[PDB]
């Protein structure tokens, strides 16, 4: 998503449904490459602590003035006719200047945005339709004409453009929780295993205290911990170096 060769243009924004994986947002937030990292659901630091049902990654190119509009509750041709976030957007907007990557020397014209629409689009809609626009009362029975403008016009991206008319890539991480089990979790920190010493142990959620020792027990390929007559834990299997 972040290192793709060619992004979608804003009218036709790509979505990737990130799920069944561990999401190391520390790689993202520590990156010197980003201009903007606006998180609306939670504070950016805590993203490695959370877990979600899915993380939709919406990707598109817009102008460096328009990146601001991607924030929730914004008014403007990108926020209204191309890509709209809901008032309770529980996610992050991430953006970077890609002028040296998306500005052909004589100008690039591959990226289109909708300048015109009969109504603002609803949150997370996408409108691929090229249907000629009804800008004038006269019905647009033609393929082109006065007041029959093509809704999709194209950006002006040139290397010598100002910050504002240089292309910004954007990705919006829409994180969601549903009634389904959360599968997009963060990377769980794992500090060194120490032995013959009284220590606080957290083995896959199992908070406890005790002296850890190398066991002579032999569990089954499926077992991960053990208990005693009292239904109290007395043995656990190391999740990284299986012992």
């Amino acid at each position, epitope marked *: 998503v972040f290192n793709a060769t060619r992004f979608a243009s804003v009218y036709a924004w790509n979505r990737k449904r990130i799920s069944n994986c561990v999401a190391d947002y520390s790689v993202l937030y520590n990156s010197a490459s980003f201009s903007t990292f606006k998180c609306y659901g939670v504070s950016p630091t805590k993203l490695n602590d959370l877990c979600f049902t899915n993380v939709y990654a919406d990707s598109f190119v817009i102008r460096g003035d328009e990146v601001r509009q991607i924030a929730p509750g914004q008014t403007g041709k990108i926020a209204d006719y191309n890509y709209k976030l809901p008032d309770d957007f529980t996610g992050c907007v991430i953006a970077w200047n890609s002028n040296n990557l998306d500005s052909k020397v004589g100008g690039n014209y591959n990226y289109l945005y909708r300048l015109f629409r009969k109504s603002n689009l609803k949150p997370f809609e996408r409108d691929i339709s090229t249907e000629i626009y009804q800008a004038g*009362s006269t019905p647009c029975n033609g393929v082109e004409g006065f007041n029959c403008y093509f809704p999709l016009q194209s950006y002006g991206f040139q290397p010598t453009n100002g910050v504002g008319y240089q292309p910004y890539r954007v990705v919006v991480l829409s994180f969601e929780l549903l009634h389904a089990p959360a599968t997009v979790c963060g990377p769980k920190k794992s500090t060194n295993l120490v032995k013959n010493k009284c220590v606080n142990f957290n083995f896959n959620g199992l908070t406890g205290t005790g002296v850890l020792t190398e066991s002579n027990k032999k569990f089954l390929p499926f077992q991960q911990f053990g208990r005693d007559i009292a239904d109290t834990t007395d043995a656990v299997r190391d999740p990284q170096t299986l012992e």
Partner: antibody
Framework: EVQLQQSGPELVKPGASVRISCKTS????????MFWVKQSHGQSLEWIGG????????TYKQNFKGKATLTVDKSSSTAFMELRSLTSEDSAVYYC????????????WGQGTTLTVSS | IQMTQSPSSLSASLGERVSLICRAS??????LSWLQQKPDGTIKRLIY???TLDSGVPKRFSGSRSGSEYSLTISSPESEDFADYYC?????????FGGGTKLEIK
């Protein structure tokens, strides 16, 4: 108030041009198209053409395209019609109008403008 | 490409029914508007989109599509409504109008 402050009654001797304004108000000027009409003292009204004040694009009746020229100025928020080489064909009550797709089509009209070309 | 208004002038008492017609030689797909002109220069829209009206204007106007014909019909005359009437055909460029019809006292 969708008013239309146009130019008052006007005269010039033939073989000469003219200047005709239509100021518009009560709306954001680039949200609507502008068109024009020529109504003679005796003969019917006809459509001269229009300008979209947003996109600076234009369209005309083929008959008038060769003698009309429509313009706007955004900072003045005003429409402006020029007549080039006026003669015995070029005299009427001229009228400005406003248009859109969502129901506001040719509803309100400038008080017109006397463009007599007689001596 | 213009449609034709049946009569050039029409005369009435107050109260009498008044029908105004703008026939069509080609299909305008129902894109048409009715306009009111006073002999002293006052222009204002009556009807659009065939049947849509009732906007800052006397409630009596009606203009439902009559097949091959486009229409205006009124539930009374009035002092100001003794005036000129015009149909606008905008379905296509170039725009055109009917020749107009004048409504008068007897």
């Amino acid at each position: 108030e969708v008013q239309l402050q146009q130019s008052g009654p006007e005269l010039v001797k033939p073989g000469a041009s003219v200047r005709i304004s239509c100021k518009t108000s009560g709306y954001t000027f680039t949200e609507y198209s502008m068109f024009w009409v020529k109504q003679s003292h005796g003969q019917s009204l006809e459509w001269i053409g229009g300008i979209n004040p947003n996109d600076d694009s234009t369209t005309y009746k083929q008959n008038f395209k060769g003698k009309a020229t429509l313009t706007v100025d955004k900072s003045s928020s005003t429409a402006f019609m020029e007549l080039r080489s006026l003669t015995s064909e070029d005299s009427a009550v001229y009228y400005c109008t406003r248009d859109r797709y969502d129901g506001r089509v040719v509803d309100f009209w400038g008080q017109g403008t006397t463009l007599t070309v007689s001596s | 490409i213009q449609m034709t208004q049946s009569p050039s002038s029409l005369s009435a008492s107050l109260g009498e029914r008044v029908s105004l017609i703008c026939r069509a030689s080609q299909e305008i797909s129902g894109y048409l508007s009715w306009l009111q002109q006073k002999p002293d220069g006052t222009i204002k829209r009556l009807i659009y989109a065939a049947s849509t009206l009732d906007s800052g204007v006397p409630k009596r106007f009606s203009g439902s599509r009559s097949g091959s014909e486009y229409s205006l019909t009124i539930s009374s005359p009035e002092s100001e409504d003794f005036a000129d009437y015009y149909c606008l055909q905008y379905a296509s460029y170039p725009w055109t109008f009917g020749g107009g019809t004048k409504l008068e006292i007897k």
